[PDB]
Design a protein around this ligand. Structure first.
Ligand SMILES: [Mg+2]
Ligand SMILES: [Mg+2]
Ligand SMILES: [Mg+2]
Ligand SMILES: [Mg+2]
Ligand SMILES: [Mg+2]
Ligand SMILES: [Mg+2]
Ligand SMILES: [Mg+2]
Ligand SMILES: [Mg+2]
Ligand SMILES: [Mg+2]
Ligand SMILES: [Mg+2]
Ligand SMILES: [Mg+2]
Ligand SMILES: [Mg+2]
Ligand SMILES: [Mg+2]
Lengths: 107, 63, 153, 61, 50, 354, 60
RNA sequence: CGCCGCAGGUGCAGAUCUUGGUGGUAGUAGCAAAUAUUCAAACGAGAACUUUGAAGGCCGAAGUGGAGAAGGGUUCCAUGU
């Protein structure tokens, strides 16, 4: 199917290692978008504003190490665009990241 | 579309700064028609233009 | 108007032209040399890839200081780039030529770029300010472009 | 319809000044019409009334 | 400045009134030879004499 | 999708009602106008009857807006149309032997029946009207018959204009340059589908090409002068305005705002006259029309001493033959011309009644 | 609101308006515009309606 | 324009010559002083840069704030391109 939705956790720390202070949160958002593209195969990725807020919660350089997100591949059947599907990535608040799998979620 | 005039007028009418003027992001077409301070007042009554509260600076730590 | 290199017979050919286009003449000359002789569909795909930085144009004559890239190896060259503005201007001219072919009633699935030429347009004057109270030019280098497509299959 | 200098010279000061006053109120009305849009006929009448005022004043002087 | 004399204000008014483009019907006249107002003055580029 | 067309019998019946009511008002007006009358009185009277009769009709439904679709407009020997003076304006007194042009429209449920007719006032019993004016009215009525016969799905809108030019040249006159007829639908008097009369290059290149369609109303207008066909303005007040529901602007004056609200309440989209208000209306209208909130209908004047005629009537287009709902009282016995139709095709279309 | 001669003072403007419009005025405010023309705001007496006066003048 | 005479402001590679135009350099140097941006949406052919909203920051009242003098002179304000 292609209206799937899954929950992942992203190692922002691993993808952000080595980046200078004033570019860490912007690079974390670029890395989240790249992760969504690699996972769902759709160029059009919409970052949720709540997820952006979560990335920027601790400032520009002290980005959280892990972020639990949910990727929902949806249909772009609302306009004429080259991309038929888009992936909307939202924020999933968790208390701990231990033993957290990639899980298929229901609608 | 472009609401620079409306933000200026609302700041003047509400007697705050443009920092505190909140224009409804969804009623953009309705706000864009307001080319007068009386229309700004009408939008303020209707709640499409809202004066945001002062950013909190607490003196509890000092006390 | 007077093109250079009139076609062998102007029944299976179509023409497109542009004057005083604000693109760099050197970049556009290299891009035009890249797409010269291509089939029209291949040239459109190539120009879109140049815009996406998936294929490069090789800078053969105007290559002073131009960097190296892996995609220049498709050509017999070392220095290549991805002129986005030149690719877009040439894509627009190609679409205009294809519409002209539609108007002339000659089928566009067989069109091949048989002639393409980039000339220097009159320069445009702007100003820059230098160290000791001095003024230097800041010229633009626009270009005329002309192209002739021909059926061959 | 226009006034001429040759048929103004037989008239006296009172009616010459009356003619001048009529032309002046006409010119003021024409200027009002000029600023409120008006029409091409009323815009072209401005020069005619101005020359008539000049003609009457020349005869008086 | 805000404080100005009547003569200065009137001079500025004349320089204001003559800083406008040519009427478009001028170029349709017989033997015109005029294309655009070459005496245009921008406030930031060229400063007035006074 | 929710528009109402002639597919419904109720729509049919109230169109017939609009035609009958416009016809009876015009029939009263043509008799009431005589020598030594005032156009202000005529306009007031034409509105006065229409108001009471539209109020009494459909007394069981008091939710719909019905009444004037086009104000009473009189044009006498020097005006083209859109003429309706206020009380403050100098009135026009009807002399002997004047030909006058009447325009008046009614609306029911937003649907329009709008009719214009030119006739001569104070015609003696047994006399003949003779002159250069005797051909222009007759040519306008021949245009009326031509339009009635030729209005049909499949006949292009560029054919009626050439037929009218042909009959005008056959009568050695010409229509006023640049006049528009329209396709009339619910709550619309200025529809996109336009018919053009005596065009030139600019109006022809700005005009559209279209094919007549089924289940629609037309207001086909013939408006022909006996001189050159050119008109301008003579510095007289514009009295007819219509609210344009497309564009909006924030009115900054209380008088203009109250005037615009009253216009929305009474004449929401239909043309009105400033007589229906005055002191504050004349001030509100300038601010309203500055920002294109009201389309004006300016008074157009021909040359002094010229004669111009007009006919117009809403024709519905049904699949098996169009019908006329508003007709003017024009008789060939009391009105002849010194020249007739010299075109075989024009004879063929005029001799065939609908 | 009128455009007046730049050489006319408030007394002259008041008397001119009174004479050539048959109205009584309360006060005259005066400025000179950036283009050089003098502008006069003539307030009318309470018993005169400036709307009606503007209608008779023809500037509505 | 040729021929017979007449008369010159009569022949250019240079003068760090005069004026005008054009090259290589060269798609090069460079667009690095004052911490910093990001997400979504709207308008739009087109958005790193416009507008709105959300977030993260800065000026930190000797301000990147609010008002004036001198000077400028319409830059002010709407609408449109
Ligand atoms: Mg180099
Ligand atoms: Mg380098
Ligand atoms: Mg510099
Ligand atoms: Mg300097
Ligand atoms: Mg300066
Ligand atoms: Mg003063
Ligand atoms: Mg010499
Ligand atoms: Mg030399
Ligand atoms: Mg030498
Ligand atoms: Mg470089
Ligand atoms: Mg740099
Ligand atoms: Mg700080
Ligand atoms: Mg300050």
């Amino acid at each position: 199917n292609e209206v799937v939705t899954r929950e992942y956790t992203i190692n922002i720390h691993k993808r952000i290692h080595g980046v200078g202070f004033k570019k860490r949160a912007p690079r974390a958002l670029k890395e989240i978008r790249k992760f969504a593209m690699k996972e769902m195969g759709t160029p059009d990725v919409r970052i949720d504003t709540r997820l952006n807020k979560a990335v920027w919660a601790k400032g520009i350089r002290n980005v959280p190490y892990r972020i639990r997100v949910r990727l929902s591949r949806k249909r772009n059947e609302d306009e004429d665009s080259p991309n038929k599907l888009y992936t909307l990535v939202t924020y999933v608040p968790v208390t701990t990241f231990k033993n957290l799998q990639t899980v298929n979620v229901d609608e | 579309s472009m609401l620079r005039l409306q933000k200026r007028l609302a700041s003047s009418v509400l007697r705050c700064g443009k920092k505190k003027v909140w224009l409804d992001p969804n009623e953009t077409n309705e706000i864009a028609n307001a080319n007068s301070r009386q229309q700004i007042r009408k939008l303020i009554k209707d709640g499409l233009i809202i004066r945001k509260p002062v950013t909190v600076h607490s003196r509890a730590r000092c006390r | 108007v007077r093109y250079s290199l009139d076609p062998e017979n102007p029944t299976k050919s179509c023409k497109s032209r542009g004057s005083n286009l604000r693109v760099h003449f050197k970049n556009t000359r290299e891009t035009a040399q890249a797409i010269k002789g291509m089939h029209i569909r291949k040239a459109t795909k190539y120009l879109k890839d140049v815009t996406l930085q998936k294929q490069c144009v090789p800078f053969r004559r105007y290559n002073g200081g131009v960097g190296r890239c892996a995609q220049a190896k498709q050509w017999g060259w070392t220095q290549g780039r991805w002129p986005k503005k030149s690719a877009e201007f040439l894509l627009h001219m190609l679409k205009n030529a294809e519409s002209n072919a539609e108007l002339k009633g000659l089928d566009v699935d067989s069109l091949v770029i048989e002639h393409i030429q980039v000339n220097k347009a009159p320069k445009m004057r702007r100003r820059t300010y230098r160290a000791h109270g001095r003024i230097n030019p800041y010229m633009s280098s626009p270009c005329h472009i002309e192209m002739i497509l021909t059926e061959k299959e | 319809a226009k006034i001429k200098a040759r048929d103004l010279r037989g008239k006296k000061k009172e009616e010459l000044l009356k003619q001048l006053d009529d032309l002046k109120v006409e010119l003021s009305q024409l200027r009002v019409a000029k600023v409120t849009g008006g029409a091409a006929s009323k815009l072209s009448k401005i020069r005619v009334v101005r020359k008539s005022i000049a003609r009457v004043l020349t005869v008086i002087n | 400045s805000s404080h100005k004399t009547f003569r200065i204000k009137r001079f500025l008014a004349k320089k204001q009134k003559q800083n406008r483009p040519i009427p478009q019907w001028i170029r349709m006249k017989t033997g015109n030879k005029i294309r655009y107002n070459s005496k245009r003055r921008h406030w930031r580029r060229t400063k007035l004499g006074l | 999708q929710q528009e109402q067309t002639i597919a419904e019998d109720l729509v049919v019946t109230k169109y017939k009602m609009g035609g009958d009511i416009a016809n009876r008002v015009l029939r009263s007006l043509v008799e009431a106008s005589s020598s030594g009358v005032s156009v202000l009185s005529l306009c007031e009277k034409g509105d006065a009857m229409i108001m009471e009769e539209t109020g009494k009709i459909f007394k069981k439904e008091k939710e719909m807006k019905k009444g004037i679709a086009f104000p009473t407009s009189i044009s006498v020997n020097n005006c083209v149309c859109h003429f309706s003076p206020l009380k403050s304006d100098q009135d026009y007194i009807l002399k002997e032997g004047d030909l006058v042009k009447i325009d008046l429209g009614v609306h029911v449920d937003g649907f329009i029946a709008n009719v214009a007719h030119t006739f001569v006032v104070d015609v003696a019993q047994g006399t003949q009207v003779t002159g250069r004016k005797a051909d222009v009215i007759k040519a306008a009525h021949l245009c009326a018959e031509a339009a009635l016969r030729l209005v049909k799905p499949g006949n292009q809108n560029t054919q009626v204009t050439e037929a009218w030019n042909k009959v005008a040249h056959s009568f050695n006159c010409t229509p006023i340059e640049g006049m528009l007829s329209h396709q009339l639908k619910q709550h619309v008097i200025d529809g996109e589908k336009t018919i053009i009369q005596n065009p030139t290059d600019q109006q022809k290149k700005d005009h559209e090409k279209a094919e007549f369609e089924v289940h629609e109303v037309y207001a086909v207008d013939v408006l022909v002068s006996s001189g050159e066909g050119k008109a301008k303005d003579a510095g007289q007040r514009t009295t007819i305005y219509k609210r344009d529901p497309s564009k909006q602007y924030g009115l900054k004056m209380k008088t203009s705002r109250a005037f615009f609200s009253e216009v929305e309440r009474r004449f929401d989209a239909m043309p009105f006259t400033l007589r229906a208000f005055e002191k504050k209306a004349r001030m509100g209208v300038v601010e309203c029309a500055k920002h294109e909130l009201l389309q004006p209908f300016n008074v157009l004047y021909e040359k002094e001493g010229e004669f111009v005629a007009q006919f117009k009537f809403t024709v519905l287009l049904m699949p098996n033959g169009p019908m006329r709902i508003t007709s003017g009282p024009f008789e060939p016995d009391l009105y002849k011309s010194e020249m007739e139709v010299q075109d075989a095709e024009l004879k063929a279309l005029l001799q065939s009644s609908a | 609101v009128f455009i007046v001669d730049v050489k006319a003072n408030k007394h002259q403007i008041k008397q001119a308006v009174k004479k050539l419009y048959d109205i009584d005025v309360a006060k005259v405010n005066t400025l000179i515009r950036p283009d050089g023309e003098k502008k006069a705001y003539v307030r009318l007496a309470p018993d005169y309606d400036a709307l009606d006066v503007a209608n008779k003048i023809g500037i509505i």
